[PDB]
Amino acid sequence: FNKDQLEEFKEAFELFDRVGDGKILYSQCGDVMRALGQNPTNAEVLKVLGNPKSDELKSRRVDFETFLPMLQAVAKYEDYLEGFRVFDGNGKVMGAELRHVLTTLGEKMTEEEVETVLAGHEDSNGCINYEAFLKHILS
Amino acid sequence: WXAXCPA
Amino acid sequence: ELYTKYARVWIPDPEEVWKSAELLKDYKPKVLQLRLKDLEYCLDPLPPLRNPDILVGENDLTALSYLHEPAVLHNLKVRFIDSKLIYTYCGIVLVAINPYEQLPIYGEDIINAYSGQNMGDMDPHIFAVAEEAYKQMARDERNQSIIVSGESGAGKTVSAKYAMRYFATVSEANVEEKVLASNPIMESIGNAKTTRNDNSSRFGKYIEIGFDKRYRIIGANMRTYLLEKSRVVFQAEEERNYHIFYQLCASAALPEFKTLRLGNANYFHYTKQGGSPVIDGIDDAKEMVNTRQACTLLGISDSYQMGIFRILAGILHLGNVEFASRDSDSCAIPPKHDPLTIFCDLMGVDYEEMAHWLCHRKLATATETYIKPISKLHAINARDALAKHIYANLFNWIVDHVNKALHSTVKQHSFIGVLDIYGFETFEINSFEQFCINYANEKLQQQFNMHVFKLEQEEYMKEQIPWTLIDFYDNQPCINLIEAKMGVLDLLDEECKMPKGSDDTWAQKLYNTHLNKCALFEKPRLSNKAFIIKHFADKVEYQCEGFLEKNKDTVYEEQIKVLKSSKKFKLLPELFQDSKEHKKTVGHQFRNSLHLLMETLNATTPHYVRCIKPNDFKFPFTFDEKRAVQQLRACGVLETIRISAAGFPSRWTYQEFFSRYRVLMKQKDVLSDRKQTCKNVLEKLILDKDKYQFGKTKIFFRAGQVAYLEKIRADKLRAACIRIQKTIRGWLMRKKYMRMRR
Amino acid sequence: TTALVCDNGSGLVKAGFAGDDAPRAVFPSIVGRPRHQGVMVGMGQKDSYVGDEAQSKRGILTLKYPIEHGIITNWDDMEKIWHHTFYNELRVAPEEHPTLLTEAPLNPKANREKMTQIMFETFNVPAMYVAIQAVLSLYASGRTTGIVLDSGDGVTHNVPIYEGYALPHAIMRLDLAGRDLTDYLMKILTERGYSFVTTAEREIVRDIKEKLCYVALDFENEMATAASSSSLEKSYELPDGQVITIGNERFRCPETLFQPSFIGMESAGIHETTYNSIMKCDIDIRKDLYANNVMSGGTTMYPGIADRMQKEITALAPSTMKIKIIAPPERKYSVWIGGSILASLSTFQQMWITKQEYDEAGPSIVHRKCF
Ligand SMILES: Nc1ncnc2c1ncn2[C@@H]1O[C@H](COP(=O)(O)OP(=O)(O)O)[C@@H](O)[C@H]1O
Ligand SMILES: Nc1ncnc2c1ncn2[C@@H]1O[C@H](COP(=O)(O)OP(=O)(O)O)[C@@H](O)[C@H]1O
Ligand SMILES: [Mg+2]
Ligand SMILES: [Mg+2]
Q: Is C201 a catalytic residue?
């Protein structure tokens, strides 16, 4: 990553500061990394944060300069397609089954998160084009 | 028998 | 060998036959650390291993991946306590645990809900086996019979109620009402109170449900076997003779009986012996009225009901008759004696003629006739043989009138039969009655062990792979040991004859003949008095004490002729109405009768129902580990588990496996004939076919291979799913940026 | 399959199946032959008669016994008596069934060998055994301690047995028996002027002996009494309706078992032989032998003989001892009955001398295995 990207990332980072010290929370680090184009697992985020304790995750604040080595470390299709074919064989996926597995298996999401990802992807029958959902989530 | 008696 | 840290494992606890543990550190290719109040543990040159919980609570026990007494024991506990599901399957076997609480489950809805339906497809219920029996009687004309087995007190009779009620609905005639009304008759004559419960069954009972050429029920036939005649004379402290005596005795006041001149049960030698007349929690006194209702509804006229009770008053009065001895050689009844006087007027014979024939044995040849006096012990053994000869004929005649009412006047095409017989047994005294019970259970479990082997061989011959992989436990050396000539019954019959004979000299002959010869017989350390048989379930120790006096019958033809002449009432000549059979000893009569039963059932396909009584105190709907284990051993289930466990316990169909493990798929996994896909795919996945056989219908795995396939299923599932959640959070916060930045 | 159980006395044949209550065929062990030139051409011809046929025809016949003094003494007629018993009396093929044969305790050892050889060669009996009479009386009388006294038509013997050990040196045989009572009865009957000379006429006497004779409790008192009155005297009919009348002459024959000098034996007489058989036994046993005395065999049937035995033996035994006599009316059968028991016991199946084991070993085997 070049200096310009780092400047753009710092500006974005400062936009997410809801406390005014030019910093985000450890618990916001994952959100900022994903918002900046990274796709780390929650496990990867906790690992790069150093498995922080609840208190520093919720209240310790870091500026862009301390964030940066972590962003670098986090930064450094066919599997995703097979992953979608897991949940299919007409190229569609039930909304109910994907909803159940995403909210009860793996890295369970909130109903609001799931409603925001799935909004607009199910048809009147309740079927999702997973190739289309994938293109959407890759956009 | 064979001696002391008739049978 | 692989067990991770945080696997779970089972360890013997003193008062729970297993306890679950986790293992706190990884075991390595002899010492262990576990979490449970925290302990080290140890090995000999493993513990059992615990099924992944999804398998726990499954209805078929052979579905489980690891099979050992813990896995069955808790799986049955969770089904019984948590899910309330009493019925469970192993292989073909059905296993039942009585709630002592009524349930919806027997309702008519459920009856219809099972009809027609293949054995896997429902959840288990007693109706499901009866339905299979019925449809086998459909597919082949051959008869199908149902075998109901277990401890005294465990709902064998109730399971029969349901097994009949299923046919009564799914098959008009009364027969369900008639048979259900029969029970208080047979339970009055044939059931008894014993140390571990009252209302045990002492005989074994078999009902045929009969069908026409289109399988409408026509009617039914009642048979009895294995009657415990020996109880009638002699008993051990806690016990009663059969209920009908006590019910009759309890009604001494009532006017119809009043001429029978009865007495409080302590008054009569046959009832008196146990000192224990009262059943706890139920008075018998009014139960006669329920018996007499059952008889009358079932068609015994009030005259014959009065006859039946008159005879029973006869037998109880007979027991009080008394012998006083002139000599060792000879004994005479005292000159004026109340019970024999009463006995005569009850049964209409000359007092002096019974007084003569009790006292003497006649002996006669073609030319000549002789009268022998006999000793006090012989006069007693004569009276007791006579009492048993009256009683077992009275029983076998009441069974015949119940049969008259229950038969149906049409040619029967085929029949389905329901058998109520009492399970293999252990008590902490064991006596010739138990020796007979355990002999019978030996034959029955042979029939099972061989029929199972047949059905497994069949299921193999559905399939390309051969039988030889199977081996099975074999009862025959024990059967011979008891049964066959110069065996533990045979020497008992011989000791009756040999001029002076006793439980001691019998035991001595037992040891001389067998003690060091054969692996199945053992002497205890601490006495000559007793011996141990290693039955298939367990070593049982039986006392020799009292085998002889219980073993013995000899009826004097010239006594029974006195009764057979009688003119007062028309039952008593009919009982005798009818050779060597007068000679036979009880043990030989039981051998014969068990062979009648066993050829009745060998001709006929069995089906099996166990009962395992969950707790001694009859607390409702609650379980004890220790009893349940003992029952499951005594029912051969734990043996069957081990045998399958080193077998090929697991079955899958191609469809069921492939449809479940599509989670494992990648497109080379799929080729249009699913059989080839599975058979190719597995070749990389697992070390060899030796773990996993293929048939034409089915896929057969060794034990434990399920738990591995489950683990790789979960591993690939989360490998895909967390990477998907990784991208879904990734983009969803990409979009949160683009929405927040704009 | 069941064991035939057979007894050859001197006097009778007693036969049946093991586990019968009583014997099924009884008949005299007697073979008849015609004394005469048969007159009528076209009558049936009988070359000989066996058993109770000869008893019917007897007035025409010589009657011979193939056994006397418990010894088989002419074989080709004894073989005929067995052939009659198996084929005609019991109606069995003997080749299917095993057999027991019965014998007096000391008799010549060749007797066992030939008695074996006939069974195995002639009939192909499956297996066989030979058993001492006074043993089988204990089985019948339900005891394992006692002194048996057993007296046949042809032999008398004590045997002491104690808890199932037979005690060989104890065992003493007399040859007094009902036959020599019978001959002596003919010789005394001549004194009152009746002469019963021929063989069938001997059997006519033998029925007198069976019916009228009784044992004097005191010999001297009744021998005076018969002079003193008619009262003892009693009378009987010959087959032809002659009457014969008999006095002290009827008890005096039983008395020859107590004073063999009347017959001219040298030996003690059955009471004193019984007491001497006890004394030859050990002092520990003796109190229990005195407790059980078992009369066996037909000769013991005489009225009062048990009360005589007790009275006379009392004067020999020590005053304190309990001495007791056992006398079931069965007793004439009791030697068969004991065999009926013995052949049924499952332990016994080890004992049968089998056709294989004989055919390998030869009839010497009967000495070794059987006793
Ligand atoms: N399936 C069941 N449903 C309801 N009650 C039962 C059941 N099984 C057993 N019982 C109870 O336990 C007893 C079992 O039957 P019972 O005839 O007394 O003994 P068994 O049938 O074992 O010989 C019944 O009296 C009843 O109280
Ligand atoms: N009731 C009797 N009283 C006296 N003597 C008898 C009686 N019955 C048979 N005898 C005689 O005793 C002999 C029969 O005794 P038995 O026991 O049959 O001999 P065995 O056992 O050798 O055949 C014959 O001599 C017969 O005449
Ligand atoms: Mg019952
Ligand atoms: Mg004799």
A: yes
